[PDB]
Amino acid sequence: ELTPDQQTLLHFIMDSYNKQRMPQEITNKLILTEMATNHVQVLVEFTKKLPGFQTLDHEDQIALLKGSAVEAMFLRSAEIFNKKLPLEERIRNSGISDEYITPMFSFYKSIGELKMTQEEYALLTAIVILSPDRQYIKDREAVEKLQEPLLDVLQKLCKIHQPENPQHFACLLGRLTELRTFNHHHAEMLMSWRVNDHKFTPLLCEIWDV
C-alpha cells in the first residue's frame, strides 16, 4: 500500500512531529497560559518544517498558521490529555461563559473517541495546517498542491489502522469540519474572557488575532 515516496514523507513528518513534545507540566494539569503558549511554540516549529512551507507566500504562511491554530490545539491537547490521564478542567473556574464550555468539550471528547494513532494525529494536523480553504489566502492552489500528498497518504493509513471500519478517514475529516464551524464562537469565547480585566501574552494575541 504505502510506497515509496509515501514512506520517506510519513517518516519525515513523524520525525518533525515527534521532536516537539510537552514537557513536565502534563502533571499539574495561570498555568493555562503556559500550556497555550507551549501549544503555539510547538505548532509553528512543526508548521515551518512541513514540506514546501518555506516556498509559500509570507502572508499566506501567517494566515495558514492563525487559521490552523484552534484545531491544532484541540488535536494536540487530545493526543496528550487522553493518553496521559489514561477531565479534570480548570476552565469553568477560569471565568469562561458556560455557553461556550459545554459545546467545546463535546468536540474534545469526540476527537478522543476517534481513537487516532500518532501517525494519524501527525498527518491530520498537517492537513489542518495546510488547509487551502482558510481566510485571506491568495495562492489557494500552491497550498492545495502541498496538501494532496499528505491526504492521499493519510487515506491509506486509515485503511491500515484499521480496515474493519471503512468510514474512519471520512469520520476523521468530519469531526474537523464539525470543529471548523466552532471557530467564530471561539473568537467570542476568548473576547468574553478578555472583558473582565484578564490579558493574554503577546504571542497569544498574535495567534488568535486579538
Binding site: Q41, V44, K48, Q61, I62, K66, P202, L203, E206, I207
Partner: peptide, 12 residues
C-alpha cells in the same frame, strides 16, 4: 502584528 510569528518561522 504577527511579528513574533514571523520571527518564529524564519528563525534558524
Amino acid at each position: 502584528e504577527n511579528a513574533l510569528l514571523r520571527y518564529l518561522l524564519d528563525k534558524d
